């Protein structure tokens, strides 16, 4: 293998058997080195294809994928797409294996290659295409699996690079507009990319459609975002459309108990939740508005913050007198 | 009473010895009657992980105590803290910090903390992940915790890439890349390599260039154009104490690997080159001030930085000594925007005008070798300098300074400069030196330290009086009266 006698006398030491595989030089070293002393060989614009078909002629045993993909610095993948002349060779060999690679049946034994397989890229300094890596994800994105969905879409905030990130959102919301396995993942994933001022309420109205029909548990999580950035005085009017949505309890006693739970850590953890939660059921039903929800909050605000005897107090008065 | 507790040892403002006493009633409290404090402890952490910043104080060392206090207290009852942990991401700077280090004794119980500490703070470094996330990277890390498949150099990595944020991101990365690396022991390479990085982008690569190094001519640390980038002193002085690092400073020699087979080439054979540099090229946004001070205060601590560089490098010959007096001339030709000087007066404060200095055994090796108590074979150079005379009576304000602070604020600052005893040591061999030379012989140096010395050798550390009231005896050093012969001597 005349891949294998670049890569050896290049000085990262054969990695052989089911064990982690040696280099003993200077990382930087074994880089710089390398990706000089190939340039220098024969057919210098010939020799790229030969060789890295040797190495998918070593991508074959999946152990072999462990010790390509297992930390070593980085992995020999995981810094061996360092060499720019191999800089933009190296992507288009790896991510295409995430399909065939997402066939068997994946429990709870380890060897996720579609973990790893797209782990690798994140905290890259130096590749080459800027674009071409998200470019080919989003449909990479296409039809895998659940669990593949997320993983692809887990890893955005840091794999994905930081150009286009209006775009990246842009796909994004529409992917989560209504959906089923993308409340946990693509919920979560819009805290990594630091969106603009503008998508936001955007996202903020897409949000609010998922959660009158949202799922058995994830009523925390969707909880968590609805008052996450709601601060501000454009909170008022948040509280009144979170009431009107939210307004009423079916079962779950760790579910009733959680809702009251983040209700509570919310309670008195941002600024202005205790005059909003309090003030859009405080004035606002006219008519058969008044609910259980709606009303044990009555006893959480007014005997969880010391500040609110006096003002849970008129309150409970009027609406009960009244 | 323990009502009396979190309602007085706070809220109650002599009147720190009220709050003092109010300690006593909820910290006995907790002491004697064992059934009745668990909800103590939950009335502490909630009255104090939300609110103002004078709780910093009061509540913060009461938390400190309680805790320390608290043999495994919460040692099988951590569920309040666990949904604690999360709210900290709006806190002050200071108070982030703290919370991180009175909860430090019982990180060291359970991965039912620590698993989810990671957590509720990685998720701040992806997004916006102010300084907090970078406190908590490095608390983590310059820890027993960080030892113990190592992963975790991901994070190692997070930093590397958090390195270019905002001049603040710069200095904190630097002002522990010292300590991440004295506990840190596989973990070299990186901090090597990474300030390689920082500092590859530093200086014109060819030699002959005008200046070996500008305000503008080193790229920078963490930005460089407004808001400066790692000061150019500091992304040295990281770069110092750091070459240092390598052999004799992280590892002594690092004969297994870090200095194995004069290793020195990766992380500093490029440093060394560098090194005698920007020494030889000392030939030759800010618009007075921060130019001056910061870019061209680079050149400050470019003699800063070099004093070590060059006066520790091996600084029996003649060569580097001579090299120190360019230097020092350099300096004092900067001394144009006012003037500068060293130390001779009563030291209650601690030299004239000032900023931050070399290491922190550096008064002691300048003061005690080159300021007298240094009589031998090769005194040659050390008359040269030693013939000073406006650099050496100008180069003892630094040792004033360091110790007109370093009781002054609580911990002076300087590479291995927090733990008390290294800084005790120290403390009382600056006053020996000072002495022997004060009382052996611009003039009022070696004992105008001592209205300083004793100060704040004495009220703001008392329990040492004997141990160090007898070091000041010439080779000694039971009781104000018992070492009374050694007070009245």
């Known amino acids: 293998g005349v891949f294998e006698e670049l890569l050896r006398t290049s000085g990262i030491i054969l990695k052989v058997g089911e064990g982690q595989n040696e280099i003993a030089v200077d990382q930087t070293a074994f880089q710089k080195k390398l990706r000089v002393a190939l340039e220098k060989h024969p057919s210098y614009p010939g020799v790229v294809n030969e060789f890295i078909s040797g190495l998918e002629s070593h991508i074959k045993d999946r152990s072999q994928f462990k010790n390509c993909l297992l930390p070593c610095c980085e992995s020999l993948i995981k810094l061996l797409l360092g060499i720019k002349i191999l800089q933009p060779a190296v992507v288009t060999l790896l991510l295409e294996k995430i399909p065939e690679f997402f066939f068997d049946v994946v429990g709870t034994f380890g060897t996720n290659f579609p973990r790893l397989i797209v782990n690798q890229f994140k905290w890259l300094d130096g590749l080459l295409d800027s674009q071409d890596l998200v470019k080919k994800l989003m449909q990479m994105l296409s039809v895998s699996p659940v669990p593949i969905q997320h993983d692809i879409i887990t890893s955005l905030p840091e794999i994905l690079e930081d150009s286009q990130q209006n775009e990246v959102a842009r796909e994004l919301s529409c992917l989560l507009k209504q959906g089923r396995r993308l409340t946990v993942p693509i919920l979560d994933a819009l805290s990594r990319l630091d969106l603009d001022a503008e998508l936001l309420a955007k996202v903020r109205q897409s949000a609010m459609t998922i959660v009158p029909s949202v799922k058995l548990e994830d009523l925390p999580v969707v909880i968590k975002f609805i008052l996450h950035n709601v601060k501000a005085a454009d909170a008022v009017e948040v509280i009144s459309d979170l009431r009107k949505s939210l307004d009423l309890s079916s079962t779950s006693q760790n579910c009733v108990k959680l809702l009251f739970d983040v209700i509570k850590l919310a309670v008195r953890f941002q600024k202005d939740v205790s005059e909003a939660w309090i003030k859009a059921i405080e004035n606002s039903t006219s008519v058969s508005d008044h609910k259980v929800l709606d009303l044990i909050v009555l006893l959480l605000i007014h005997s969880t913050n010391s500040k609110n005897r006096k003002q849970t107090e008129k309150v409970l008065r009027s609406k009960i007198r009244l | 009473?323990?009502?009396?507790?979190?309602?007085?040892?706070?809220?109650?403002?002599?009147?720190?010895?009220?709050?003092?006493?109010?300690?006593?009633?909820?910290?006995?409290?907790?002491?004697?009657?064992?059934?009745?404090?668990?909800?103590?402890?939950?009335?502490?952490?909630?009255?104090?992980?939300?609110?103002?910043?004078?709780?910093?104080?009061?509540?913060?060392?009461?938390?400190?105590?309680?805790?320390?206090?608290?043999?495994?207290?919460?040692?099988?009852?951590?569920?309040?803290?666990?949904?604690?942990?999360?709210?900290?991401?709006?806190?002050?700077?200071?108070?982030?910090?703290?919370?991180?280090?009175?909860?430090?004794?019982?990180?060291?119980?359970?991965?039912?903390?620590?698993?989810?500490?990671?957590?509720?703070?990685?998720?701040?470094?992806?997004?916006?992940?102010?300084?907090?996330?970078?406190?908590?990277?490095?608390?983590?890390?310059?820890?027993?915790?960080?030892?113990?498949?190592?992963?975790?150099?991901?994070?190692?990595?997070?930093?590397?890439?958090?390195?270019?944020?905002?001049?603040?991101?710069?200095?904190?990365?630097?002002?522990?890349?010292?300590?991440?690396?004295?506990?840190?022991?596989?973990?070299?390479?990186?901090?090597?390599?990474?300030?390689?990085?920082?500092?590859?982008?530093?200086?014109?690569?060819?030699?002959?260039?005008?200046?070996?190094?500008?305000?503008?001519?080193?790229?920078?640390?963490?930005?460089?154009?407004?808001?400066?980038?790692?000061?150019?002193?500091?992304?040295?002085?990281?770069?110092?104490?750091?070459?240092?690092?390598?052999?004799?400073?992280?590892?002594?020699?690092?004969?297994?690997?870090?200095?194995?087979?004069?290793?020195?080439?990766?992380?500093?054979?490029?440093?060394?080159?560098?090194?005698?540099?920007?020494?030889?090229?000392?030939?030759?946004?800010?618009?007075?001030?921060?130019?001056?001070?910061?870019?061209?205060?680079?050149?400050?601590?470019?003699?800063?930085?070099?004093?070590?560089?060059?006066?520790?490098?091996?600084?029996?010959?003649?060569?580097?000594?001579?090299?120190?007096?360019?230097?020092?001339?350099?300096?004092?030709?900067?001394?144009?925007?006012?003037?500068?000087?060293?130390?001779?007066?009563?030291?209650?404060?601690?030299?004239?005008?000032?900023?931050?200095?070399?290491?922190?055994?550096?008064?002691?090796?300048?003061?005690?070798?080159?300021?007298?108590?240094?009589?031998?074979?090769?005194?040659?150079?050390?008359?040269?300098?030693?013939?000073?005379?406006?650099?050496?009576?100008?180069?003892?304000?630094?040792?004033?300074?360091?110790?007109?602070?370093?009781?002054?604020?609580?911990?002076?600052?300087?590479?291995?400069?927090?733990?008390?005893?290294?800084?005790?040591?120290?403390?009382?061999?600056?006053?020996?030196?000072?002495?022997?030379?004060?009382?052996?012989?611009?003039?009022?140096?070696?004992?105008?330290?001592?209205?300083?010395?004793?100060?704040?050798?004495?009220?703001?550390?008392?329990?040492?009086?004997?141990?160090?009231?007898?070091?000041?005896?010439?080779?000694?050093?039971?009781?104000?009266?018992?070492?009374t012969e050694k007070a009245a001597f």
């Open chain 2, 1 to 483: 009473l323990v009502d009396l507790g979190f309602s007085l040892m706070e809220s109650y403002e002599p009147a720190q010895q009220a709050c003092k006493l109010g300690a006593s009633i909820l910290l006995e409290t907790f002491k004697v009657h064992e059934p009745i404090r668990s909800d103590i402890l939950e009335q502490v952490l909630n009255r104090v992980l939300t609110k103002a910043a004078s709780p910093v104080s009061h509540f913060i060392d009461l938390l400190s105590n309680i805790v320390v206090s608290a043999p495994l207290v919460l040692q099988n009852s951590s569920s309040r803290v666990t949904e604690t942990f999360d709210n900290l991401s709006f806190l002050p700077i200071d108070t982030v910090q703290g919370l991180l280090r009175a909860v430090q004794p019982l990180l060291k119980v359970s991965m039912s903390v620590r698993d989810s500490l990671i957590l509720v703070l990685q998720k701040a470094i992806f997004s916006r992940q102010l300084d907090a996330r970078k406190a908590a990277v490095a608390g983590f890390l310059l820890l027993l915790r960080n030892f113990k498949e190592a992963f975790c150099l991901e994070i190692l990595g997070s930093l590397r890439r958090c390195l270019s944020q905002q001049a603040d991101v710069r200095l904190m990365l630097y002002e522990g890349f010292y300590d991440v690396l004295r506990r840190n022991s596989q973990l070299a390479s990186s901090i090597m390599e990474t300030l390689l990085s920082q500092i590859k982008q530093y200086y014109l690569p060819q030699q002959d260039l005008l200046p070996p190094l500008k305000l503008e001519g080193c790229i920078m640390a963490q930005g460089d154009q407004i808001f400066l980038q790692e000061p150019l002193a500091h992304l040295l002085c990281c770069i110092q104490h750091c070459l240092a690092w390598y052999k004799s400073t992280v590892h002594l020699c690092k004969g297994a690997e870090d200095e194995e087979e004069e290793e020195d080439v990766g992380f500093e054979q490029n440093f060394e080159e560098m090194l005698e540099s920007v020494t030889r090229r000392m030939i030759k946004s800010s618009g007075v001030g921060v130019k001056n001070n910061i870019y061209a205060i680079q050149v400050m601590g470019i003699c800063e930085v070099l004093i070590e560089y060059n006066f520790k490098i091996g600084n029996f010959s003649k060569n580097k000594f001579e090299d120190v007096l360019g230097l020092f001339t350099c300096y004092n030709k900067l001394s144009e925007i006012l003037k500068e000087k060293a130390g001779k007066n009563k030291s209650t404060l601690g030299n004239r005008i000032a900023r931050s200095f070399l290491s922190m055994g550096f008064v002691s090796t300048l003061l005690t070798a080159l300021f007298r108590d240094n009589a031998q074979s090769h005194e040659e150079s050390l008359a040269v300098l030693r013939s000073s005379t406006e650099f050496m009576r100008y180069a003892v304000s630094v040792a004033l300074q360091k110790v007109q602070q370093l009781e002054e604020m609580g911990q002076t600052d300087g590479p291995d400069g927090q733990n008390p005893e290294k800084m005790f040591q120290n403390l009382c061999k600056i006053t020996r030196v000072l002495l022997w030379r004060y009382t052996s012989i611009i003039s009022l140096l070696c004992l105008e330290g001592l209205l300083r010395i004793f100060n704040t050798m004495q009220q703001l550390y008392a329990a040492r009086i004997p141990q160090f009231l007898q070091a000041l005896d010439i080779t000694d050093g039971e009781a104000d009266i018992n070492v």
